[PDB]
Amino acid sequence: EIRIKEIKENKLIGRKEIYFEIYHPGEPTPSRKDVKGKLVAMLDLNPETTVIQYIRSYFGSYISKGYAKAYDSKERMLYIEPEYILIRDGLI
């Protein structure tokens, strides 16, 4: 259950930043690969040119706040996003 609160476009960088909430009552925090796949499938994104900046769970709440980015191209990805995030997301 993904509800996207905000989508904003940055032409100066060339990326779409998405702020969303995952509503998972009675279920663990969704895995990064599951969240990426669901977001890419629903929003029609390029899976090799998008990362999940963070997923945060706040105390006894079943709603986790997720922030993700989708760059225009792999060149912008390697230019802006750093090495540790690239290893974590497995796009390099």
Binding site: R3, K5, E21, Y23, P25, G26, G60
Partner: protein, 128 residues
């Protein structure tokens, strides 16, 4: 699951109807306690409430807590969010969140908040 949600709401309602008001011992005896109703743990050596004798007021315990799924929710089932302006009002989820306008907000801003909530479909707990 909506069925489980409703069942747990009913369970919480029954539990909190049965729950007593935990109050300091001898609260009724003095105005200094009756005017400030709180709970304080009895710590005396001969305190009957500390000894947990029958026929005496009970003490708070971890077992009285609400079920985890519906803990802290509004009795209507929504989750309350305190709102101070239109920007905070617009960030709510109309399907599962309700807006409570801060008591300090004036009428001029409350009118705009109510209008925006009505045109966004967001429930308001205190509409003026």
């Amino acid at each position: 699951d909506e069925k489980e949600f409703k069942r747990l709401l009913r369970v919480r309602a029954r539990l909190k109807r049965k729950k007593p008001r935990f109050l300091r011992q001898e609260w009724w005896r003095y105005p200094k306690f009756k005017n400030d109703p709180k709970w304080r743990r009895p710590k005396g050596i001969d305190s009957k409430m500390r000894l947990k004798l029958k026929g005496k007021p009970r003490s708070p315990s971890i077992g009285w807590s609400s079920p985890k799924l519906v803990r802290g929710l509004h009795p209507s089932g929504y989750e309350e969010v305190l709102v101070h302006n239109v920007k905070e009002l617009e960030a709510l989820d109309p399907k599962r969140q309700a807006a409570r306008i801060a008591h300090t907000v004036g009428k001029k801003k409350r009118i705009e908040i109510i209008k925006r909530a009505e045109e966004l479909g967001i429930k308001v707990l205190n509409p003026r």
